[PDB]
Write a protein that binds this ligand. Structure first.
Ligand SMILES: [Mg+2]
Ligand SMILES: [Zn+2]
Ligand SMILES: [Zn+2]
Lengths: 79, 98, 1337
RNA sequence: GAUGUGUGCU
DNA sequence: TCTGAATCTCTTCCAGCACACATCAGGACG
DNA sequence: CGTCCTTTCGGAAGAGATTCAGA
């Protein structure tokens, strides 16, 4: 469940980068096969992404590092 | 009254008006300022492109929505091309650079 | 895909390049088997196939034949959408002038050829001839000859030289004209000539010619040899009901043009006589002018119903054009509307969507789950399933709707709170249930207004709706730091009734053991909600490092105030509910909860307050009856006394003791006093009515009158309205404004007369017509404000400036209108403020003045803080985040990249509906006295007389802060002096409103220098006193002998020589103006500061704000001194009197004409400074700009418009007005060129000058000096660098013609151009997108 | 489909 | 007797939203 | 049918356009 996004704004201190980071994570959960990093309570992808931002285990830097690591792994497995 | 998709106008490919014609509410000039004040750039873009004039990016959004996806490939509103052609129908050459 | 939009003229080669064919037959669809014609306005071979992937003749019908043009009819097999993209063209038999470039005012054709518009139009419409290539004759290249003159010229000089007419002659003139030679000649003439009107005309001409040379245009392209046509699908022939085809105005205009074009071609093939083909060419010219811009000619042609038909230029401009109807705003899918009801069970983030409306909005979302759960196999199956509304699509809908916010918009979206996103709850019904606490933000009651639901589709749109537009995130207004989630009118009546004390109860001596026992006793009916019990309550406080420590106490409260304590969160003091909570008390309770506990506890608290107010307002049964409006027993006696007094005044008037006006004023005053007495008696009898036995003898208490309770709580009521219900209605005004001298002596409880009710309707309909005509005037103002300031966006984070404005508390002469704390809160300082421990730094240079710093500034008693304002920011095309300050909606600095110029305009324009549309100095308090710009002398009576108009008398407190400010006129006697401790309630300065004196400074003898009776003095002796009054006549009445002789009153010594004025080497020559009566006689000793001679002598509504923001010059502008130094006169009133100012050191080339209507505050013997007033009246905010600076004009605009708003009780922060002022200061004229490439009188943008000068100073060169300009919000929008914003704002034709001739270019950098084009605005998330886009190039 | 008229609601 | 300042015509715009009706070249010669 | 044809209850900026009255 989600009502207020204040803690997420505290973690990503712009509220305009928060929208972009949460949208990126929600599109990862929705279009991609990525699983949520938090036990969902039958929430939608946007609310799960916002909660993961609140719990602290995602931001723009973490998402970029994870994407770069997975791209490197896919390149290595390509041979 | 409510409308998801219906008939669209002829010269400007926008949703029709009123309740008799299965028409959509007019996101007016003053509501655009309210979206600009919030900073809601993506909501505003999907208001004036996808669920409006832009015909090519309007069916792709419908397919995405009934595809499990929520993502738009926006283009140029077909009412701006109407404006370009109506200005070009005067003795005025108006064009897009690169 | 594209990063700029370029507009220019169109060459005939370019127009042929656009076209896919030529239209030659003026015939639309065949009125047959409905197929297009051969070469008509609708044609398959030119524009495209009517059917998709089908040829017109029917030879090809499939996709495999795509690309090959047919042979029978020449129609390529392709999409049918090419009929709205492929243009044609018309080859005009004769050249035709574009109406836009001929009648744009100024005329581009008329200005390019330096010919008047009348001559150009005469030659164009074949009413005369113009001369080309005059040769070796007496006829020049720009001479006009009528028919008889042309016949005479052919008789005398009928050689190969030719003169022509029509657009062909003008095209020949334009083509034979050389641009560069004309530019050189006109630059030389500009350098040579001295006439200023000639100078500006020449520089306008040179600007046009240089713009034509630079751009890839040619002068003769204005004359249309080829005229293009719109594609058919943009001017469709829609089939009406029947075999008929609905009219299209463009098709009629195109057929009209082709008719005359074909007739002209046929006539020119037949070698018809010259007059007939001349008339045919004139008719073709008129047809083309009606096609392009119908109505710009004298009489617009009408197609049918005697109404002008819509041309090409009429569907690009105006409210019904392409810009303001289909591009700036548009109709939107996935949307609906319905009536709104209450639904008080919702939470702050919830709305209630009808179950039949959410199934239509979220229809594709339901499809995408009926096709994913295996409940359907294709789109048709799911479509029919939701069509028949099975019992399985209601749980699919309840899952789609789970956490998908929807926007709720109310039609007059005045500010941004009018669109908020709510989580939907499916309800049975057809009304959109809307939470009660957001109604104040929406300005929405439930008397029948409707809302529109919009559905955010994409993930970014949903997360914007949740993180930016959610009603949870908007509990502070963006206009000021005020809360917007405020309980109103039923929640506050419930909380007022619950938290009140009556001195008796069911249980009043009982001592409770907690709030829960209080609720248990109230619900059981063992105690009253208004008891006076002692409850043992534990309250938490976070005085530690964010840690809550408890304290338990035994407090004397009521049962209701203890029941309410069960909802107040942990952290708030108990003395927040231990009172009688009105509206302000609980608004302040929510405000302190927000600042102590944050946002989430406040959002939880607001719903609890709403529920517990509704419940205990329902439980009270707080009704209203007719016995609740208590008429005073003394109302009849007061009315009778007033009747007796007006009868006495009438008796006095009949005897002739008083005049008509005095009688009227006395009657009005005594009736006002009677109304005040009735109101006071009624209010006392209402407020303290309830007398209740206190378990002893008897006691008074605040009354439980129902109407008084709902007036006291602030729920719904005032003092004026309760006065009109129980007291008397009072004095009513005529429609013009004059008060009727007999008030309404009755009230709504006991009737109104037939005449007393008709009298009320004057002011009843005045205030309804006002609000009817006021909406259309406030909407225009907020639209202009948005379009001026639309594109500021906070772009940088710090600009590093040491400039700013000196924020000081505003003092009008009495109580402080606004303290320093409100004017300086949440803004970044510019310099370190000095504590009165002088030379010790109190605050740093770039700190954010939040509440903690404002309290510290107040403790040290500072009264002037230099702060960083938006108008002084140094960034380009944006505003730094530090030169703006607090967000005012969020509790931090403004985020980089968010549109402050739209928030400013909305915040200023939203309260537009609340504004209307149609002596001696008495020091009030204790303190010291200061005089600004001291210029005074001691009078012989022992006191001071001041000799300068710009003085200010300031009453200072004992701390040192400025508390009162007054203006002291010229020659006013003081009662005390500077630095002397005055007593509150005494007059300090005295003067006369009339009788302007010419008082001296020192004593001596007076000799009437250049004063003899009959020459400059008329013989007009005051008959009342008999003293010979030396009255100098004015300019008109005096003879010619008194004009060249200027009277003077020189103060001499005993020997008759010149008494020297101290401080200078000039004597005391006092020149007298007209109407200066002299009571003193010759040979009289004068006093120190005695009157030698005496001279006897607006709107604050919405129009005032519009005039301030549009910078209109007032009718009688105050005159200001444009240079310092001494002042004198010149020629003897050369029509208007010439005033000459001479500086002490520099030369004196300045001299201004002044009409004798305005009385000069200055005399011939004063040294004036620049910016000081030479007359009286409202200053135009251009003189302030160019004399007193930029900060002076921003302070003037801010103070004036804020006074207008504050008179009506509207709070708007000054950031917004400073933003609009900054957008009003964008142009900057050039003084001298220097090493830059700007023209001399060219008005170019300030940021361009700034960047050019800063890159010149980086090198060894020297920049350019500029004079800052100020334009109104309507002129600063049309003169912006983007021709798309200007075209979509106003005057589309006037902007597009200038942009076309100048070959202008649009970079799409604002907020409106990106909306029009269709890409992301550079304001929110689009700011990050545009930063990436610009960094990629 | 465009315009006009009129009513009404904000 | 050529020139800057004071009058003289003509341009533009005047908040948003639904909903009823009417009119859409038609007159006329061939 | 087929087909051709032709007034008038506004207020500001501003851009001609004239006048004036002055040297
Ligand atoms: Mg209402
Ligand atoms: Zn064919
Ligand atoms: Zn700045």
């Amino acid at each position: 469940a989600r009502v207020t996004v204040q803690d997420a704004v505290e973690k990503i201190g712009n509220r305009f980068d928060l929208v972009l980071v949460a949208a990126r994570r929600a599109r990862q959960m929705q279009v991609g096969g990525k699983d949520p990093l938090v036990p969902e309570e039958n929430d939608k992808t946007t609310v799960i992404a916002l909660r993961e931002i609140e719990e602290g285990l995602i931001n723009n830097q973490i998402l970029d590092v994870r994407e770069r690591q997975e791209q490197q792994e896919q390149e290595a497995a390509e041979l | 009254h409510a409308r998801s998709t219906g008939s669209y106008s002829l010269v400007t490919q926008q949703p029709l008006g009123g309740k008799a014609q299965f028409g959509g509410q007019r996101f007016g000039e003053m509501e655009v300022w309210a979206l600009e004040a919030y900073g809601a750039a993506y909501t505003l873009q999907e208001m004036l492109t996808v669920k409006s004039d832009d015909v090519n990016g309007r069916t792709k959004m419908y397919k995405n929505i009934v595809d499990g996806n929520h993502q738009m490939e926006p283009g140029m509103p077909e009412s701006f091309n109407v404006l370009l052609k109506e200005i070009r129908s005067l003795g005025i050459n108006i064009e897009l650079e690169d | 895909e594209f990063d700029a939009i370029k507009i220019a003229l169109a060459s005939p080669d370019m127009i042929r390049s656009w076209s896919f064919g030529e239209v030659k037959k003026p015939e639309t669809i065949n009125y047959r088997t409905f197929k297009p014609e051969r070469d008509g306005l609708f044609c398959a071979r030119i524009f495209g196939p009517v059917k998709d992937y089908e040829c017109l003749c029917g030879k090809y019908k499939r996709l495999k034949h795509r690309g090959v043009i047919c042979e029978k009819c020449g129609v390529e097999v392709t999409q049918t959408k090419v009929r709205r993209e492929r243009m044609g063209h018309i080859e005009l038999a004769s050249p035709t002038a574009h109406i836009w470039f001929l009648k744009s005012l100024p005329s581009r054709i008329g200005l390019l050829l330096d010919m008047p518009l009348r001559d150009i139009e005469r030659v164009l419409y074949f009413e005369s001839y113009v001369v080309i290539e005059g040769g070796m004759t007496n006829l020049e290249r720009q001479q006009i000859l009528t028919e008889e003159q042309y016949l005479d010229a052919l008789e005398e000089f009928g050689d190969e030289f030719d003169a022509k007419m029509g657009a062909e002659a003008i095209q020949a003139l334009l083509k034979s004209m050389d641009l560069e030679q004309e530019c050189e000649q006109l630059r030389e003439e500009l350098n040579e000539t001295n006439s200023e009107t000639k100078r500006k005309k020449l520089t306008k001409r040179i600007k046009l010619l240089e713009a034509f040379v630079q751009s890839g245009n040619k002068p003769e392209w204005m004359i249309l040899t080829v005229l293009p046509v719109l594609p058919p699908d943009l001017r469709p022939l829609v089939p009406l009901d029947g075999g008929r085809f609905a009219t299209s105005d463009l098709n009629d205009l195109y057929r009209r043009v082709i008719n005359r074009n074909n007739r002209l071609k046929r006539l020119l093939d037949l070698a018809a006589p010259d007059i007939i083909v001349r008339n045919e060419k004139r008719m073709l010219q008129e047809a083309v002018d009606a096609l392009l811009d119908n109505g710009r000619r004298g009489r617009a042609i009408t197609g049918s119903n005697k109404r002008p038909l819509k041309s090409l230029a009429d569907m690009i401009k105006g409210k019904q054009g392409r810009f303001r109807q289909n591009l700036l705003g548009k109709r939107v899918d996935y949307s609906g509307r319905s009536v709104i009801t209450v639904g008080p069970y919702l939470r702050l983030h919830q709305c209630g969507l009808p179950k039949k409306m959410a199934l239509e909005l979220f229809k594709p979302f339901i499809y995408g789950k009926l096709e994913l759960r295996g409940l359907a196999t294709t789109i048709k199956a799911a479509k029919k399933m939701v069509e028949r509304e099975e019992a399985v699509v209601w749980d699919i809908l309840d899952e789609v709707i789970r956490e998908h916010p929807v926007l709720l918009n109310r039609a007059p979206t005045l500010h941004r709170l009018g669109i908020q996103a709510f989580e939907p709850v499916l309800i049975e019904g057809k009304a959109i249930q809307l939470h009660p606490l957001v109604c104040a933000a929406y300005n929405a009651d439930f008397d029948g207004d409707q809302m529109a639901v919009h559905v955010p589709l994409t993930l970014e749109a949903q997360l914007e709706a949740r993180a930016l537009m959610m009603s949870t995130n908007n509990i502070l207004s963006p206009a000021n730091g005020e809360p917007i989630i405020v309980p109103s009118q039923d929640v506050v009546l419930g909380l007022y009734y619950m938290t009140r004390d009556c001195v008796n109860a069911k249980g009043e001596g009982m001592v409770l053991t907690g709030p829960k026992e209080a609720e248990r006793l109230y619900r059981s009916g063992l105690a009253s909600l208004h008891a006076r019990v002692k409850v043992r309550i534990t309250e938490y406080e976070k005085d530690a490092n964010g840690e809550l420590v408890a304290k338990t106490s035994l407090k004397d409260t009521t049962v209701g105030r203890a029941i309410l304590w069960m909802i107040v969160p942990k952290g708030l003091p108990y003395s927040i509910v231990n009172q009688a909570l009105g509206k302000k008390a609980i608004s302040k309770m929510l405000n302190t909860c927000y600042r102590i506990l944050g946002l989430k506890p406040t959002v939880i608290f607001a719903d609890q307050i709403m529920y517990t107010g509704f419940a205990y307002a329902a439980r009270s049964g707080a009704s209203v009856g007719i016995d609740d409006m208590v008429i005073p027993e003394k109302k009849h006696e007061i009315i009778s006394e007033a009747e007796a007094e007006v009868a006495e005044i009438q008796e006095q008037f009949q005897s002739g003791l008083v005049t008509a006006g005095e009688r009227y004023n006395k009657v009005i005053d005594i009736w006002a006093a009677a109304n005040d007495r009735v109101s006071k008696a009624m209010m006392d009898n209402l407020q303290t009515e309830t007398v209740i036995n206190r378990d002893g003898q008897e006691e008074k208490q605040v009354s439980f009158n129902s109407i008084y309770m709902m007036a006291d709580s602030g729920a719904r009521g005032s003092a004026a309205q309760i006065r009109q219900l129980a007291g008397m209605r009072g004095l009513m005004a005529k429609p013009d404004g004059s008060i009727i001298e007999t008030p309404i002596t009755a009230n709504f409880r006991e009737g109104l007369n037939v005449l007393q009710y008709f009298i009320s309707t004057h002011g009843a309909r005045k205030g309804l017509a006002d609000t009817a005509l006021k909406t259309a005037n406030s909407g225009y103002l907020t639209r202009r404000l948005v379009d001026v300031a639309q594109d500021l966006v906070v772009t940088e984070d710090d600009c590093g400036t040491h400039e700013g404005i000196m924020m000081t508390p505003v003092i009008e002469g009495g109580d402080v209108k606004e303290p320093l704390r409100d004017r300086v809160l949440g803004r970044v300082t510019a310099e370190d403020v000095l504590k009165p421990g002088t030379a010790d730094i109190l605050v740093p240079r770039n700190t954010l003045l939040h509440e903690q710093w404002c309290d510290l500034l107040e403790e040290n008693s500072v009264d002037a803080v230099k702060v960083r304002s938006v108008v002084s920011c140094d960034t380009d095309f944006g505003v730094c985040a530090h030169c703006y300050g607090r967000d005012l909606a969020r509790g931090h600095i403004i985020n980089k990249g968010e549109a402050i110029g739209v928030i400013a305009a909305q915040s200023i324009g939203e309260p537009g509906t609340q504004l209307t549309m149609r002596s001696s100095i008495q020091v009030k308090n204790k303190g010291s006295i200061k005089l600004s710009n001291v210029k005074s002398v001691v009078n012989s009576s022992g006191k001071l007389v001041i000799t300068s108009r710009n003085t200010e008398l300031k009453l200072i407190d004992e701390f040192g802060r400025t508390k009162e400010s007054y203006k002291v006129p010229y020659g006013a006697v003081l009662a005390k002096g500077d630095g002397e401790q005055v007593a509150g309630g005494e007059t300090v300065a005295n003067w006369d409103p009339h009788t302007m004196p010419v008082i001296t400074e020192v004593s001596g003898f007076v000799r009437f220098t250049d004063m003899i009776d009959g020459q400059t003095i008329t013989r007009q002796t005051d008959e009342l006193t008999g003293l010979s009054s030396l009255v100098v006549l004015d300019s008109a009445e005096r003879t010619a002998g008194g004009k060249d002789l200027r009277p003077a009153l020189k103060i001499v010594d005993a020997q008759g020589n010149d008494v020297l004025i101290p401080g200078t080497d000039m004597p005391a020559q006092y020149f007298l103006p007209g109407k200066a009566i002299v009571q003193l006689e010759d040979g009289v000793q004068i006093s120190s500061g005695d009157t030698l001679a005496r001279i006897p002598q607006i709107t604050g509504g919405l129009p005032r704000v519009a005039d301030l923001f549009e910078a209109r010059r007032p009718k009688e502008p105050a005159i200001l001194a444009e240079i310092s130094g001494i002042v004198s006169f010149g020629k003897e009133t050369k029509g208007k009197r010439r005033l000459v100012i001479t500086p002490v050191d520099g030369s004196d080339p300045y001299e201004e004409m002044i009409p004798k209507w305005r009385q000069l505050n200055v005399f011939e013997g004063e040294r004036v400074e620049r910016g000081d007033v030479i007359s009286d009246g409202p200053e135009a905010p251009h003189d302030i700009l160019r004399l007193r600076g930029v900060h002076a004009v921003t302070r003037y605009i801010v103070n004036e418009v804020q006074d207008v708003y504050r008179l009506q009780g509207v709070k708007i922060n000054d950031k917004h007005i400073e933003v609009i002022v900054r957008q009003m200061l964008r142009k900057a004229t050039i003084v001298n060129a220097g090493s830059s490439d700007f023209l001399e009188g060219e008005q170019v943008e300030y940021s361009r000058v700034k960047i050019a000068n800063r890159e010149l100073e980086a090198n060894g060169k020297v920049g350019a000096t500029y004079s800052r300009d100020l334009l109104g919000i309507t002129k600063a929008s049309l003169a912006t660098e983007s021709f798309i914003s200007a075209a979509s704002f106003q005057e589309t034709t006037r902007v597009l013609t200038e942009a076309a001739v100048a070959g202008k270019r649009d970079e799409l950098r604002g907020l409106k151009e990106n909306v029009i084009v269709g890409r992301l605005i550079p304001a929110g998330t689009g700011y990050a997108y545009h930063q990436d886009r610009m960094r990629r190039r």
